Coordinates of N, CA and C and ligand atoms in Angstrom, one line a residue:
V3 N 25.5 8.2 22.0 CA 24.9 8.2 23.3 C 23.5 9.0 23.2
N4 N 22.5 8.5 23.9 CA 21.2 9.1 24.0 C 20.8 9.1 25.5
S5 N 19.7 9.8 25.8 CA 19.2 10.1 27.1 C 18.3 9.1 27.7
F6 N 17.9 8.0 27.0 CA 17.1 7.0 27.5 C 17.8 6.2 28.7
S7 N 17.1 6.0 29.8 CA 17.7 5.5 31.0 C 16.9 4.3 31.6
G8 N 17.7 3.4 32.2 CA 17.0 2.3 32.9 C 16.4 1.2 32.0
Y9 N 16.8 1.1 30.7 CA 16.3 0.1 29.8 C 17.2 -1.1 29.8
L10 N 16.5 -2.3 29.7 CA 17.2 -3.5 29.5 C 17.5 -3.7 28.0
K11 N 18.7 -4.1 27.6 CA 19.0 -4.3 26.2 C 18.6 -5.7 25.7
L12 N 17.7 -5.8 24.7 CA 17.3 -7.1 24.3 C 18.2 -7.6 23.1
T13 N 18.5 -6.7 22.2 CA 19.3 -7.0 21.0 C 20.2 -5.8 20.7
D14 N 20.9 -5.8 19.6 CA 21.8 -4.7 19.1 C 21.0 -3.4 19.1
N15 N 19.7 -3.5 18.7 CA 18.9 -2.2 18.5 C 17.6 -2.1 19.3
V16 N 17.2 -3.1 20.1 CA 16.0 -3.0 20.8 C 16.2 -3.1 22.3
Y17 N 15.6 -2.1 23.0 CA 15.7 -1.9 24.4 C 14.2 -1.9 25.0
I18 N 14.1 -2.3 26.3 CA 12.8 -2.4 26.9 C 12.8 -1.9 28.3
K19 N 11.7 -1.3 28.8 CA 11.6 -0.8 30.1 C 10.2 -0.8 30.6
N20 N 10.0 -1.1 31.9 CA 8.7 -1.0 32.5 C 8.5 0.5 32.8
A21 N 7.6 1.2 32.0 CA 7.4 2.6 32.1 C 6.1 3.0 31.5
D22 N 5.6 4.1 31.9 CA 4.5 4.8 31.3 C 5.0 5.7 30.2
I23 N 4.6 5.4 29.0 CA 5.2 6.0 27.8 C 4.9 7.5 27.8
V24 N 3.8 8.0 28.5 CA 3.6 9.4 28.6 C 4.6 10.0 29.5
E25 N 4.9 9.4 30.6 CA 5.9 10.0 31.6 C 7.3 9.9 30.9
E26 N 7.6 8.8 30.2 CA 8.9 8.7 29.6 C 9.0 9.7 28.5
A27 N 8.0 10.0 27.7 CA 8.0 11.0 26.7 C 8.2 12.4 27.3
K28 N 7.5 12.7 28.4 CA 7.6 14.0 29.1 C 9.1 14.2 29.6
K29 N 9.8 13.2 30.0 CA 11.1 13.3 30.5 C 12.2 13.3 29.5
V30 N 12.1 12.5 28.5 CA 13.1 12.4 27.5 C 12.9 13.4 26.4
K31 N 11.7 13.7 26.0 CA 11.4 14.6 24.9 C 12.0 14.0 23.7
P32 N 11.8 12.8 23.3 CA 12.4 12.1 22.2 C 12.1 12.8 20.9
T33 N 12.9 12.6 19.9 CA 12.6 13.0 18.5 C 11.3 12.5 18.0
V34 N 11.1 11.2 18.3 CA 9.9 10.5 17.8 C 9.3 9.7 19.0
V35 N 8.0 9.9 19.3 CA 7.2 9.0 20.1 C 6.2 8.3 19.1
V36 N 6.0 7.0 19.3 CA 5.1 6.3 18.5 C 3.7 6.2 19.2
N37 N 2.7 6.5 18.5 CA 1.3 6.3 19.0 C 0.7 5.0 18.4
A38 N 0.0 4.2 19.3 CA -0.8 3.1 18.9 C -2.1 3.6 18.3
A39 N -2.1 4.0 17.1 CA -3.2 4.7 16.5 C -4.2 3.7 15.8
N40 N -5.4 4.2 15.5 CA -6.3 3.5 14.6 C -6.4 4.3 13.3
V41 N -7.1 3.8 12.3 CA -7.1 4.4 11.0 C -7.8 5.8 11.0
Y42 N -8.6 6.0 11.9 CA -9.4 7.3 12.0 C -8.7 8.3 12.9
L43 N -7.5 7.9 13.5 CA -6.8 8.8 14.4 C -7.8 9.3 15.5
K44 N -8.7 8.4 16.0 CA -9.6 8.7 17.1 C -8.9 8.1 18.4
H45 N -8.3 9.0 19.2 CA -7.4 8.7 20.3 C -8.2 8.5 21.6
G46 N -9.0 7.5 21.6 CA -10.0 7.3 22.7 C -9.5 6.7 24.0
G47 N -8.6 5.7 23.8 CA -8.2 4.9 24.9 C -6.9 4.2 24.7
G48 N -6.4 3.4 25.6 CA -5.1 2.8 25.5 C -4.0 3.8 25.5
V49 N -3.0 3.5 24.8 CA -1.8 4.4 24.6 C -2.3 5.7 24.0
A50 N -3.1 5.6 22.9 CA -3.5 6.8 22.2 C -4.3 7.7 23.1
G51 N -5.3 7.2 23.8 CA -6.0 8.1 24.7 C -5.2 8.7 25.8
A52 N -4.2 8.0 26.3 CA -3.3 8.6 27.3 C -2.4 9.6 26.7
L53 N -1.8 9.4 25.5 CA -0.9 10.4 24.9 C -1.8 11.6 24.5
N54 N -3.0 11.4 24.0 CA -3.8 12.6 23.6 C -4.2 13.4 24.9
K55 N -4.6 12.7 25.9 CA -4.9 13.4 27.2 C -3.7 14.3 27.7
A56 N -2.5 13.7 27.6 CA -1.3 14.5 28.0 C -1.1 15.7 27.2
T57 N -1.6 15.8 25.9 CA -1.5 17.0 25.1 C -2.7 17.9 25.2
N58 N -3.6 17.6 26.2 CA -4.7 18.5 26.4 C -5.6 18.5 25.2
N59 N -5.7 17.4 24.5 CA -6.5 17.2 23.3 C -5.9 17.8 22.0
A60 N -4.8 18.5 22.1 CA -4.2 19.1 20.9 C -3.9 18.0 19.8
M61 N -3.4 16.8 20.3 CA -3.2 15.7 19.3 C -4.5 15.4 18.6
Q62 N -5.6 15.3 19.2 CA -6.9 15.0 18.6 C -7.3 16.1 17.6
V63 N -7.1 17.4 18.0 CA -7.5 18.5 17.1 C -6.6 18.4 15.8
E64 N -5.3 18.2 15.9 CA -4.5 18.1 14.8 C -4.8 16.9 13.9
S65 N -5.1 15.8 14.6 CA -5.5 14.5 13.9 C -6.8 14.7 13.1
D66 N -7.8 15.4 13.7 CA -9.0 15.6 12.9 C -8.8 16.4 11.7
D67 N -8.0 17.4 11.7 CA -7.6 18.1 10.5 C -6.9 17.2 9.5
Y68 N -6.0 16.4 10.0 CA -5.3 15.4 9.1 C -6.3 14.5 8.3
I69 N -7.2 14.0 9.1 CA -8.2 13.0 8.5 C -9.1 13.8 7.5
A70 N -9.5 15.0 7.9 CA -10.4 15.7 7.0 C -9.7 16.0 5.6
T71 N -8.4 16.2 5.6 CA -7.7 16.4 4.4 C -7.3 15.2 3.6
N72 N -6.9 14.1 4.4 CA -6.2 13.0 3.7 C -7.0 11.7 3.8
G73 N -8.1 11.6 4.6 CA -8.8 10.4 4.8 C -8.1 9.4 5.7
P74 N -8.7 8.3 6.0 CA -8.1 7.4 7.0 C -6.8 6.8 6.5
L75 N -6.0 6.4 7.5 CA -4.8 5.6 7.3 C -5.2 4.2 6.9
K76 N -4.2 3.4 6.4 CA -4.3 2.0 6.2 C -3.9 1.2 7.5
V77 N -4.5 0.1 7.7 CA -4.0 -0.8 8.7 C -2.6 -1.3 8.3
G78 N -1.6 -1.1 9.1 CA -0.2 -1.3 8.8 C 0.5 0.0 8.4
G79 N -0.2 1.1 8.2 CA 0.4 2.3 7.8 C 0.6 3.3 9.0
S80 N 1.0 4.5 8.6 CA 1.5 5.5 9.6 C 1.4 6.9 9.0
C81 N 1.4 7.9 9.8 CA 1.7 9.2 9.4 C 2.5 9.9 10.5
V82 N 3.3 10.9 10.1 CA 4.0 11.8 11.1 C 3.3 13.0 11.3
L83 N 3.0 13.3 12.6 CA 2.4 14.6 13.0 C 3.2 15.1 14.2
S84 N 2.7 16.3 14.7 CA 3.5 16.9 15.8 C 3.5 16.0 17.0
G85 N 4.6 16.1 17.8 CA 4.7 15.5 19.1 C 4.2 16.4 20.2
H86 N 3.8 17.6 19.9 CA 3.2 18.5 20.9 C 4.2 18.7 22.0
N87 N 3.7 18.6 23.3 CA 4.6 18.7 24.5 C 5.3 17.4 24.8
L88 N 5.2 16.4 24.1 CA 5.7 15.1 24.4 C 7.0 14.7 23.7
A89 N 7.2 15.2 22.5 CA 8.3 14.8 21.6 C 8.3 15.8 20.4
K90 N 9.4 15.7 19.6 CA 9.4 16.6 18.4 C 8.2 16.1 17.5
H91 N 8.2 14.8 17.2 CA 7.2 14.3 16.3 C 6.5 13.1 17.0
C92 N 5.3 12.9 16.5 CA 4.5 11.6 16.8 C 4.4 10.8 15.6
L93 N 4.9 9.6 15.5 CA 4.6 8.7 14.5 C 3.4 7.8 14.9
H94 N 2.2 8.1 14.2 CA 1.0 7.4 14.5 C 1.0 6.2 13.6
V95 N 1.1 5.0 14.2 CA 1.2 3.7 13.5 C 0.0 2.9 13.8
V96 N -0.6 2.3 12.8 CA -1.8 1.5 12.9 C -1.4 0.0 12.9
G97 N -1.3 -0.7 14.0 CA -1.2 -2.1 14.1 C -2.6 -2.7 13.9
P98 N -2.7 -4.0 13.5 CA -4.0 -4.6 13.4 C -4.6 -4.8 14.7
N99 N -6.0 -4.6 14.8 CA -6.8 -4.7 16.0 C -7.5 -6.1 15.9
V100 N -7.0 -7.0 16.7 CA -7.6 -8.4 16.7 C -9.1 -8.3 17.1
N101 N -9.5 -7.4 18.0 CA -10.9 -7.2 18.4 C -11.7 -6.6 17.3
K102 N -11.2 -6.3 16.1 CA -11.9 -6.0 14.9 C -11.7 -7.0 13.8
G103 N -10.9 -8.1 14.0 CA -10.7 -9.1 13.1 C -9.6 -8.9 12.0
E104 N -8.7 -8.0 12.2 CA -7.7 -7.6 11.2 C -6.5 -8.6 11.3
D105 N -5.9 -8.7 10.1 CA -4.9 -9.8 9.9 C -3.6 -9.5 10.6
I106 N -3.2 -10.4 11.4 CA -2.0 -10.2 12.3 C -0.8 -10.1 11.5
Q107 N -0.8 -10.7 10.3 CA 0.4 -10.5 9.4 C 0.7 -9.1 9.2
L108 N -0.3 -8.2 9.3 CA -0.1 -6.8 9.1 C 0.8 -6.1 10.2
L109 N 1.0 -6.9 11.3 CA 1.8 -6.4 12.3 C 3.3 -6.1 11.9
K110 N 3.8 -7.0 11.0 CA 5.1 -6.7 10.4 C 5.2 -5.4 9.6
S111 N 4.2 -5.3 8.8 CA 4.1 -4.0 8.0 C 4.0 -2.8 8.9
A112 N 3.3 -2.9 10.0 CA 3.2 -1.8 10.9 C 4.6 -1.4 11.5
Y113 N 5.3 -2.4 12.0 CA 6.6 -2.2 12.5 C 7.6 -1.7 11.5
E114 N 7.4 -2.0 10.2 CA 8.4 -1.5 9.2 C 8.4 0.0 9.1
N115 N 7.3 0.7 9.6 CA 7.3 2.2 9.6 C 8.4 2.7 10.5
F116 N 8.7 1.9 11.6 CA 9.8 2.4 12.5 C 11.1 2.6 11.8
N117 N 11.4 1.9 10.7 CA 12.7 1.9 10.1 C 13.0 3.2 9.4
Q118 N 11.9 4.1 9.2 CA 12.1 5.4 8.7 C 12.6 6.4 9.7
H119 N 12.9 6.0 10.9 CA 13.3 6.9 12.0 C 14.5 6.2 12.7
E120 N 15.6 7.0 12.9 CA 16.8 6.4 13.5 C 16.6 6.0 15.0
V121 N 15.8 6.7 15.7 CA 15.6 6.4 17.1 C 14.1 6.7 17.5
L122 N 13.5 5.8 18.2 CA 12.0 6.0 18.6 C 11.8 5.5 20.0
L123 N 10.9 6.2 20.7 CA 10.2 5.7 21.9 C 8.9 5.1 21.5
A124 N 8.6 3.8 21.8 CA 7.4 3.2 21.3 C 6.7 2.3 22.3
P125 N 5.4 2.0 22.1 CA 4.8 0.9 22.8 C 4.9 -0.4 21.8
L126 N 4.5 -1.5 22.4 CA 4.3 -2.7 21.6 C 3.1 -2.6 20.7
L127 N 3.3 -2.6 19.4 CA 2.1 -2.5 18.5 C 1.2 -3.7 18.7
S128 N -0.1 -3.3 18.5 CA -1.2 -4.3 18.6 C -1.4 -4.9 20.0
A129 N -0.6 -4.5 21.0 CA -0.8 -5.0 22.4 C -2.0 -4.2 23.0
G130 N -2.2 -4.5 24.3 CA -3.2 -3.9 25.1 C -4.6 -4.1 24.4
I131 N -5.3 -3.0 24.3 CA -6.7 -3.1 23.8 C -6.8 -3.5 22.3
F132 N -5.6 -3.5 21.6 CA -5.7 -4.0 20.2 C -5.7 -5.5 20.2
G133 N -5.5 -6.2 21.3 CA -5.9 -7.6 21.4 C -4.8 -8.7 21.0
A134 N -3.6 -8.3 20.5 CA -2.6 -9.2 20.1 C -1.9 -9.7 21.3
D135 N -1.1 -10.8 21.1 CA -0.3 -11.3 22.2 C 1.0 -10.4 22.2
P136 N 1.3 -9.8 23.3 CA 2.5 -8.9 23.4 C 3.8 -9.6 23.2
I137 N 3.9 -10.9 23.6 CA 5.1 -11.7 23.3 C 5.3 -11.8 21.8
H138 N 4.3 -12.1 21.1 CA 4.4 -12.1 19.6 C 4.8 -10.7 19.1
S139 N 4.1 -9.7 19.6 CA 4.5 -8.3 19.1 C 5.9 -8.0 19.3
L140 N 6.5 -8.4 20.5 CA 7.9 -8.2 20.8 C 8.8 -8.9 19.8
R141 N 8.4 -10.2 19.5 CA 9.2 -11.0 18.5 C 9.2 -10.3 17.1
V142 N 8.0 -9.8 16.7 CA 7.9 -9.2 15.4 C 8.8 -7.9 15.4
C143 N 8.7 -7.1 16.5 CA 9.5 -5.9 16.6 C 11.0 -6.2 16.4
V144 N 11.5 -7.2 17.2 CA 12.9 -7.5 17.1 C 13.3 -8.0 15.7
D145 N 12.4 -8.7 15.1 CA 12.8 -9.3 13.7 C 12.4 -8.4 12.6
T146 N 11.9 -7.2 12.8 CA 11.5 -6.2 11.8 C 12.2 -4.9 11.9
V147 N 12.3 -4.3 13.1 CA 12.9 -3.0 13.3 C 14.4 -3.1 13.3
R148 N 15.1 -2.3 12.5 CA 16.5 -2.3 12.5 C 17.1 -1.0 13.0
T149 N 16.2 0.0 13.2 CA 16.6 1.3 13.9 C 16.5 1.1 15.4
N150 N 16.9 2.1 16.1 CA 17.0 2.0 17.6 C 15.7 2.3 18.2
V151 N 15.1 1.3 18.9 CA 13.8 1.4 19.4 C 13.8 1.1 20.9
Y152 N 13.2 2.0 21.7 CA 13.1 2.0 23.1 C 11.6 1.7 23.4
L153 N 11.3 0.5 23.9 CA 10.0 0.1 24.2 C 9.6 0.3 25.6
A154 N 8.4 1.0 25.8 CA 7.9 1.3 27.1 C 6.7 0.3 27.3
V155 N 6.7 -0.5 28.4 CA 5.7 -1.4 28.7 C 5.1 -1.0 30.0
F156 N 3.8 -0.6 30.0 CA 3.1 0.0 31.2 C 3.0 -1.0 32.3
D157 N 2.6 -2.2 32.0 CA 2.3 -3.2 33.0 C 3.5 -3.9 33.5
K158 N 3.8 -3.8 34.8 CA 5.0 -4.4 35.3 C 5.0 -6.0 35.2
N159 N 3.8 -6.6 35.5 CA 3.7 -8.0 35.3 C 4.0 -8.5 33.9
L160 N 3.4 -7.8 32.9 CA 3.7 -8.1 31.5 C 5.2 -7.9 31.2
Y161 N 5.7 -6.8 31.6 CA 7.2 -6.5 31.4 C 8.0 -7.7 31.8
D162 N 7.8 -8.2 33.1 CA 8.6 -9.3 33.6 C 8.4 -10.6 32.7
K163 N 7.1 -10.8 32.2 CA 6.9 -12.0 31.4 C 7.6 -11.8 30.0
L164 N 7.6 -10.6 29.5 CA 8.3 -10.4 28.2 C 9.8 -10.6 28.3
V165 N 10.4 -10.1 29.3 CA 11.8 -10.3 29.5 C 12.1 -11.8 29.8
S166 N 11.4 -12.4 30.7 CA 11.7 -13.8 31.1 C 11.5 -14.8 30.0
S167 N 10.6 -14.5 29.0 CA 10.3 -15.4 27.9 C 11.1 -15.0 26.6
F168 N 11.9 -14.0 26.7 CA 12.6 -13.5 25.4 C 13.7 -14.5 25.0
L169 N 13.6 -14.8 23.7 CA 14.6 -15.7 23.2 C 15.7 -14.9 22.4
Ligands
LIG1 O1 -1.5 5.5 34.4 S1 -1.4 4.3 33.5 O2 -1.6 3.0 33.9 C1 -2.1 4.6 32.0 C2 -0.7 4.0 31.3 C3 -0.4 4.8 30.0 N1 1.0 4.6 29.6 C4 1.4 3.4 28.8 N2 2.6 3.2 28.6 C5 3.1 2.1 27.9 N3 2.3 1.3 27.4 C6 0.9 1.4 27.5 N4 -0.1 0.7 27.1 C7 -1.3 1.2 27.5 C8 -1.0 2.4 28.2 C9 0.4 2.5 28.2 C10 0.1 4.4 32.7

């Protein structure tokens, strides 16, 4: 039993809710919140900008030190950093950004990072400003993640479309 509330069950291990991931993180304080990161961990907009703003820029400060030491992530890769006031840990995962021309096949690799964590609160990777089709992202999630994932979808209209079209 866990504290996630109001989710629709899609499969054995995937759950979905119309929610603001920032507000959901603030209330649940999950072990892991996933950030929709880029390779430079520059948290300017989308989910990343919102999560970072909620940490009063502490996520960005920590991220800049990470990059200065380790260099950029790979598209499809991830790193574990602090969850600050939102979660125990933040798993920064880089899905391909279609608006930069990155290969969508890397979306499966991106979701594979979730399998290293038993339970996660997450957005749909490569959705929103990353330019991928969220219906495809949900399909890849369901067919790749085997651990327990709670997906927060900010847009109510999109949420209803994802549920109604789910196979
Ligand atoms: O005030 S807001 O419209 C800003 C938004 C931030 N929270 C999100 N939650 C889940 N997926 C998301 N994708 C992009 C943002 C987002 C609530």
